[PDB]
Structure 1
């Protein structure tokens, strides 16, 4: 492939459409459903997974192709999210208080990132361009920032004294820091319970879809204030019972998968590509 990646692909505008590959896609694919604990608690059934697998079979998926992963809550799920199957549908409960955390999780899992380590104790770090962010994940990520100037002296802060730093994150499981580009910063992060990485957003991750259960369109997967794009993979539904939610997911799995593109599944299950 790589020797033909930078080569043109020519096609005529009269080639006959091929038959529907939805059946073949379902047969040779795997589906991962991510739901919160409250869903399982409300269902209160020990065979609901088997029921959903049988219903998906009625919808064409082979038996052992649909998998279900449970997370305690949005904040818990945001610590090193792992996307396993070819298609990853995430049922995210809506809370008016966790809006930024919902947006950060969606941004992390609905996009492909290229991350590198940051040794905050040794080097001063800056963000090169609008695609560059600092993604911090851990049990408790408290990030404080001290911008510098051309002479390396801090502005509004003292490098020696951390108490003067401009705190930007406190007690966070996942945070995406966006500082002014081209400015060197000195960072204080709770490295004991936090890991911060310099990440670049390569583009969309088309095999991950997020269904927001309840609320309104609040997700903002773009740091740019001027744009809040709602993509095809950002679904939203209204709910009263989790069983109805799962039935809607099963029945319209055709539409959900049709909004997602395969071949975006990395060899690893991580939410980012780690490079040294």
Structure 2
């Protein structure tokens, strides 16, 4: 059990495919859904959770392995999302005005970020690679940046007059900022109501699954404007009600969990 190390693995091509770990992973794992308040609002039923649980019970998932966790709105969810389960599903409504925020949410939860803190009053920060971004959470973040030159002086901005800084956010609950990698930036931030963290995007999180409910696929996880990929756990649906959506999820929960895979870290 050599943890903290990475060793060469080996195998063969003559070994046969083993049994189906389904009907056991459901029992020794847990499934957490994240629905919006609009769903329960439209529904207007108190026993819909027990109903979906008794339905899951047919697919194999036992009674107390399923969890439902409401969220009033996509931004309130983006505010410190704490996903601690063994299989997470996230039903996400589409709004053309919220596109960037509901893509930042995806880039935050679908992936696994290694996040170090940040202190703006003392230091001036720079990015090193293309995956070392700055994610800001809080209730209203107003972020301004002033890049510096080789000799610690601004570029189109002054290091005293914060009004001359360059604005990238304006009262956003979640922000993910990428800047030019190789230049030191001086920052202004609403530290009182927002925390900023310098995070490196590691390999992806195979434990969550986003399901867009409405419009066409728009989520550009990769900040670089060349890939625009569609990952396997990035699902779309077209909706007019919510019971049909929940029945679809329950009937196709095995494909979802096949698209997902228990975490590594």
Q: Normalized against structure 2, the TM-score is what?
A: 0.98
1:236-251 mapped onto 2 (5 Å cutoff)? 236-251=236-251
TM-aligned CA deviation for residue 4 of structure 1: 7.8
C-alpha distance 106-4 of structure 1, shift in aligned 2 (>3 A):
closer
Instruction: Work out whether residues 111 and 201 of structure 2, in 8 Å CA contact, stay in contact via their aligned partners in 1.
Output: yes
Q: Output one character per residue of 1:13-56: Cα deviation in whole Å (capped at 9) or x when no partner.
A: 11111111011110100000001111110111001011011111
TM-aligned CA deviation for residue 264 of structure 1: 4.1
C-alpha distance 236-148 of structure 1, shift in aligned 2 (>3 A):
same
State the match for 1:105 in structure 2: 105
Inter-partner Cα distance in structure 2 for 1:21 and 1:36: 32
Q: Output one character per residue of 1:227-253: Cα deviation in whole Å (capped at 9) or x when no partner.
A: 111111100000110111101010000
C-alpha distance 264-212 of structure 1, shift in aligned 2 (>3 A):
farther
Instruction: Work out whether residues 31 and 65 of structure 2, in 8 Å CA contact, stay in contact via their aligned partners in 1.
Output: yes
Q: Output one character per residue of 1:87-106: Cα deviation in whole Å (capped at 9) or x when no partner.
A: 00000111111110111000
TM-aligned CA deviation for residue 121 of structure 1: 1.1
TM-aligned CA deviation for residue 75 of structure 1: 0.7
TM-aligned CA deviation for residue 84 of structure 1: 2.1
Inter-partner Cα distance in structure 2 for 1:103 and 1:2: 38
Q: Output one character per residue of 1:244-269: Cα deviation in whole Å (capped at 9) or x when no partner.
A: 1101010000000000001347xxxx
Q: Secondary structure at the match of 2:35?
A: strand
Inter-partner Cα distance in structure 1 for 2:106 and 2:184: 28
C-alpha distance 264-72 of structure 1, shift in aligned 2 (>3 A):
farther
Inter-partner Cα distance in structure 2 for 1:116 and 1:5: 22
Instruction: Work out whether residues 120 and 187 of structure 2, in 8 Å CA contact, stay in contact via their aligned partners in 1.
Output: yes
State the match for 2:259 in structure 1: 259
Q: Secondary structure at the match of 1:24?
A: coil
C-alpha distance 16-4 of structure 1, shift in aligned 2 (>3 A):
farther
TM-aligned CA deviation for residue 5 of structure 1: 3.9
Q: Output one character per residue of 1:117-156: Cα deviation in whole Å (capped at 9) or x when no partner.
A: 1101110011111010000000111110000001110001
| Dislocated runs of 4+, deviation >3 Å | 1-5
Q: How many residues align?
A: 265
Inter-partner Cα distance in structure 1 for 2:3 and 2:248: 44
Instruction: Work out whether residues 205 and 263 of structure 2, in 8 Å CA contact, stay in contact via their aligned partners in 1.
Output: no
Instruction: Work out whether residues 80 and 137 of structure 1, in 8 Å CA contact, stay in contact via their aligned partners in 2.
Output: yes
Inter-partner Cα distance in structure 1 for 2:5 and 2:257: 26
Instruction: Work out whether residues 35 and 91 of structure 2, in 8 Å CA contact, stay in contact via their aligned partners in 1.
Output: yes
Q: Secondary structure at the match of 2:127?
A: coil
Q: Normalized against structure 1, the TM-score is what?
A: 0.94
Q: Output one character per residue of 1:68-118: Cα deviation in whole Å (capped at 9) or x when no partner.
A: 001111111001101121000000111111110111000000000001111
Inter-partner Cα distance in structure 2 for 1:230 and 1:158: 41
Q: CA RMSD in A?
A: 1.1
